[PDB]
Design a protein around this ligand. Structure first.
Ligand SMILES: CC(=O)SCCNC(=O)CCNC(=O)[C@H](O)C(C)(C)COP(=O)(O)OP(=O)(O)OC[C@H]1O[C@@H](n2cnc3c(N)ncnc32)[C@H](O)[C@@H]1OP(=O)(O)O
Ligand SMILES: [Cl-]
Ligand SMILES: [Cl-]
Ligand SMILES: [Cl-]
Ligand SMILES: [Cl-]
Ligand SMILES: [Cl-]
Ligand SMILES: [Cl-]
Ligand SMILES: [Cl-]
Ligand SMILES: [Cl-]
Ligand SMILES: [Cl-]
Ligand SMILES: [Cl-]
Ligand SMILES: [Cl-]
Ligand SMILES: [Cl-]
Ligand SMILES: [Cl-]
Ligand SMILES: [Cl-]
Ligand SMILES: [Cl-]
Ligand SMILES: [Cl-]
Ligand code: NA
Ligand code: NA
Ligand code: NA
Lengths: 718, 153
């Protein structure tokens, strides 16, 4: 310890880290360390440089050896926290920053970083303490005040949050800016604090007082209407909501709220004044006719003869305009299945009216006029309709009528392809979809749908070629490599599921793992906003970000990818030949076990050689990525070769279980997992949880329990 | 058919809608960056199931030209199914109002490839944009981009 000459080099080591390009810094570390290996801080700086460029445990070893040598030094703890945060190990990083700060209490930047980690780990208790110490360090900046108030708001301590916001706002008697946007957002947040503490009554009074300060006019007026409806101030809500319709008369909730203000509708259902209820909407037709809501919204709650009258005018309205979206609009009305028949019989009559005449029904010939092209969209509606209803014979007959009339229309071929898909014929469905794409080569949408149907038909490579047209093909694995970078969820899912039924497990596991990586990224993307949001002063928005991230893994996409991975991991455990990703014909031969040992050995010899060729192929791919830094080690084969697939299945199950009550399938998979793990008490409870919901007569429940009985009685012998 | 201000929860839905009809994509953090930096500027159109159908990703220019504040449309698209409705035009007018009222934007700007007939016909004709100029090989494929400006006066 303590040398004058080594100090100049020790500092250059640190400065070189800050300036990146860690090669120069390591050059300043090496001469000193070889003859003085026992310096803790020194080993650490060597480590982070070896970590910063990489890779990787080479750094950790120098870091950990240095952190053991200097107990003791905040420098070693700070750097250990750096590489941990870099490697996304947050619980370990946070514990490093608290120790780094305990050894250097005057260094505030550590706390500024610590708050980020504590916000990410959702440690609201310790977060508040940290934000508080930062506020005491620098009460000057408004951001530190908001950060403490928000942290306290998240803990549920609204009163303490109130005092903080109110204390700060009084320290500026002159103003008004400041930002004026920070002020506007702060006030809305303060109004949220009051609402959460003193109730709606006080929050309403406060909101009216801060009206001059709020720049976001929609946020104010919407919050006002919510309050005024709660306090049953209907005449005030009436006018306020009217201001909202003036700005945006396409917002459904506004009409539902205006109806509630008139008392024509309850908070849930519309009761009653059914005559004046329509009358409002008729007056809402005076709200400039550029909005479809006044005519369309009542179609949801209308019934009987008044529905038939209005749905007729509505359908004629969109048919004469030639709107291709006409079915998708009315589509939601089919929830009751009674209106479905009414709409069906109505447009079926539209079909044979245009037969002899050009006018709908019969009595429309008394009002004369005519329409030329309405048969198209009537046929197209009927084509979509019966496909939805599931006729498929009637459906396909109608698209052909539409295609025969106008062969150049893309949408007609989209529906026909769907019908072929519903008919179970995927090959011809794929061809029709590709024909639809050929009709529009500049539209990425129709291209994407085309690749999907190619995927559903298990043509993965043909699909990759198809999407190669619309992707940035510069670097990483082609179009598909770019689709992973852009977090395209649907493709990785459809591609992986395709590989799954082709028994290509390595690639299926690869695609599914990408979905995992996408969600992990989304979960991690909020990190910088634990700082940046308070700099902009978007408090109520930051709150939404925090609450969104809490349930971020509760998604159909993650569920499907996790479920699929576990299913493949089950196969890897069950079948010894699953590791080699055998072809479907080869997979069925070994799964039947009817073949002799002569043919059996032959298949394995092939499967091993083919695996080696894929492994050899993977290396050439890695050499390609490297020469072009962070590479990709698993080009897809590394996952499927796992020593214990049960562990990996267990990892995939982790973020499925918390949401298992609304998705009982997680409990079933859990039962299936621990059944194989020979852990029956933990297997049975999960099976029981899945039995409570949806269970008893459920097919997936009895098949799991049947599987459960087969293994448990196999643990013993008789 | 329900148009409304965009929230955090429907950001991924906007990204999906972008990955479906644009070539021309960003990762979710950049959407997050829009939500935090300019929370009321982005709008969203929604189908009966609550899923994002159309959107407008809007922002104020971080480094304003000459020092005058102005808005910028980074992305806007509608699913092929819901096109020819007025969704985009209505998404634009809501976002435009917010730019002026909250941030005091003196104008708004965007980029369109010269071959996009639907986009140009939307801005120059129905939304009253002016063509400020042409940017050579702006897009990755090398296509030129029209710089469009709508001045508020
Ligand atoms: C900065 C931005 O990213 S620039 C690039 C924009 N993104 C894209 O173009 C991606 C794919 N295309 C789309 O998503 C859509 O077609 C959009 C966004 C261009 C248009 O949205 P839409 O809701 O369909 O159009 P909208 O109905 O709102 O606007 C109306 C006008 O658009 C025009 N328009 C829309 N589509 C077309 C079309 N295919 N052909 C000709 N004109 C069209 C019409 O002139 C219409 O005028 P009108 O009032 O007389 O009917
Ligand atoms: Cl607490
Ligand atoms: Cl504040
Ligand atoms: Cl309280
Ligand atoms: Cl309501
Ligand atoms: Cl009815
Ligand atoms: Cl589909
Ligand atoms: Cl795509
Ligand atoms: Cl399928
Ligand atoms: Cl925070
Ligand atoms: Cl901060
Ligand atoms: Cl960013
Ligand atoms: Cl659907
Ligand atoms: Cl929604
Ligand atoms: Cl700004
Ligand atoms: Cl920009
Ligand atoms: Cl307009
Ligand atoms: Na392109
Ligand atoms: Na940022
Ligand atoms: Na995107």
């Amino acid at each position: 310890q303590l040398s004058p000459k080594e100090i100049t080099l020790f500092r250059t080591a640190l400065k070189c880290y800050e300036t990146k390009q860690y090669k120069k810094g390591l050059k300043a570390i090496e001469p000193l360390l070889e003859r003085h290996p026992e310096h803790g801080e020194s080993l650490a700086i060597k480590g982070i440089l070896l970590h910063s460029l990489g890779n990787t445990k080479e750094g950790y070893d120098n870091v950990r050896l240095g952190l053991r040598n200097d107990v003791g030094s905040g420098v070693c703890w700070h750097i250990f926290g750096l590489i941990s945060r870099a490697d996304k190990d947050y619980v370990q990083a946070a514990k490093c920053y608290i120790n780094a700060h305990k050894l250097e209490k005057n260094n505030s930047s550590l706390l500024r970083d610590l708050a980020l980690l504590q916000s990410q780990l959702r440690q609201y208790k310790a977060l508040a303490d940290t934000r508080n110490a930062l506020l005491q360090d620098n009460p000057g900046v408004r951001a530190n005040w908001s950060a403490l108030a928000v942290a306290q708001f998240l803990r549920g301590e609204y009163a303490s949050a109130y005092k903080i916001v109110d204390a700060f706002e009084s320290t500026i008697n002159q103003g008004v800016p400041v930002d004026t946007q920070e002020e506007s957002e702060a006030m809305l947040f303060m109004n949220l604090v009051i609402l959460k503490k003193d109730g709606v009554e006080d929050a309403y009074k406060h909101l009216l007082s801060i009206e001059k300060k709020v720049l976001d006019r929609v946020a104010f007026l919407e919050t006002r209407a919510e309050y005024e409806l709660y306090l049953s101030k209907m005449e005030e809500a009436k006018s306020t909501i009217y201001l909202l319709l003036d700005r945006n008369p396409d917002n459904h909730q506004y009409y539902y709220n205006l109806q509630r203000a008139y008392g024509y509708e309850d908070a849930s259902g519309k009761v009653l004044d059914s005559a004046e209820w329509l009358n409002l909407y008729s007056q809402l037709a005076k709200r400039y006719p550029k909005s479809e809501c006044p005519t369309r919204l009542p179609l949801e709650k209308l019934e009987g003869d008044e529905f038939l009258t209005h749905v007729d005018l509505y359908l004629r309205k969109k048919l004469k305009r030639g709107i291709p979206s006409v079915f998708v609009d009315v589509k939601s009305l089919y929830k009751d299945t009674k209106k479905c028949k009414v709409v069906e019989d109505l447009v079926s009559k539209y079909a044979s009216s245009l037969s002899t005449t050009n006018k709908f029904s019969e009595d429309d010939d008394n009002s004369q006029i005519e329409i030329p092209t309405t048969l198209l969209w009537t046929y197209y509606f009927l084509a979509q309709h019966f496909d939805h209803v599931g006729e498929l014979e009637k459906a396909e007959k109608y698209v052909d009528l539409a295609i025969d009339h106008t062969p150049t229309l893309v949408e007609l071929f989209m529906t026909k392809a769907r019908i072929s898909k519903h008919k179970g014929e995927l090959q011809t469905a794929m061809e029709i979809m590709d024909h639809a794409r050929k009709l529009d080569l500049q539209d990425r949408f129709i291209n994407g749908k085309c690749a999907k149907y190619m995927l559903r038909n298990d043509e993965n490579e043909l699909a990759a070629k198809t999407v190669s047209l619309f992707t940035r093909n510069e670097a990483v694995g082609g179009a598909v490599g770019d689709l992973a970078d852009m977090q395209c969820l649907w493709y990785m899912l459809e591609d992986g599921k395709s590989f799954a039924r082709q028994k290509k497990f390595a690639l299926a596991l690869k695609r599914f793992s990408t979905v995992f990586k996408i969600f992990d990224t989304w979960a991690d993307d909020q990190f910088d906003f634990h700082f940046f949001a308070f700099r902009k002063g978007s408090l109520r928005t930051y709150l939404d970000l925090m609450s969104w991230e809490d349930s971020v893994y509760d998604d159909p996409s993650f569920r499907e990818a996790a479920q699929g991975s576990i299913e493949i991991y089950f196969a890897l455990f069950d079948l010894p030949f699953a590791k080699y990703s055998p072809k479907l014909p080869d997979f069925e031969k070994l799964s039947s076990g009817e073949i002799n040992e002569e043919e059996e050995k032959k298949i394995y010899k092939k499967l091993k050689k083919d695996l080696s060729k894929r492994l050899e192929r993977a290396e050439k791919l890695k050499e390609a990525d490297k020469s072009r830094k962070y590479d990709e080690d698993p080009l897809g084969e590394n996952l499927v070769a796992t020593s214990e697939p049960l562990k990996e299945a267990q990892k995939c199950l982790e973020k499925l279980l918390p949401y298992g009550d609304k998705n009982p399938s997680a409990y079933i998979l859990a039962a299936q997992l621990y059944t194989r793990l020979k852990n029956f008490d933990t297997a049975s409870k999960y099976l029981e949880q899945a039995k409570v919901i949806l269970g008893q007569n459920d097919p997936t429940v009895i098949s799991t329990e049947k599987f459960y009985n087969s293994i448990k009685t196999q643990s013993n012998a008789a | 058919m329900d148009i409304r201000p965009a929230r955090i929860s429907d950001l991924t839905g906007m990204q999906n809608c972008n990955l479906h009809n644009l070539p021309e994509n960003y990762q979710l953090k950049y959407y997050l960056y829009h939500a935090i930096s300019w929370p009321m500027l982005s709008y969203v159109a929604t189908d009966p199931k609550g899923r994002v159908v159309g959107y407008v990703l809007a922002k104020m220019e971080e480094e304003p030209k000459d020092g005058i504040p102005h808005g910028h449309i980074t992305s806007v698209s509608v699913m092929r199914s819901y096109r020819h409705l007025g969704l985009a035009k209505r998404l634009m007018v809501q976002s435009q109002r917010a730019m002026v009222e909250v941030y005091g934007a003196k104008y708004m700007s965007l980029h369109v490839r010269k071959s996009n007939r639907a986009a140009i016909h939307l801005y120059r004709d129905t939304l009253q944009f002016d063509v400020q100029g042409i940017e050579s090989k702006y897009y990755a494929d090398g296509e030129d981009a029209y710089a469009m400006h709508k001045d508020f006066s």
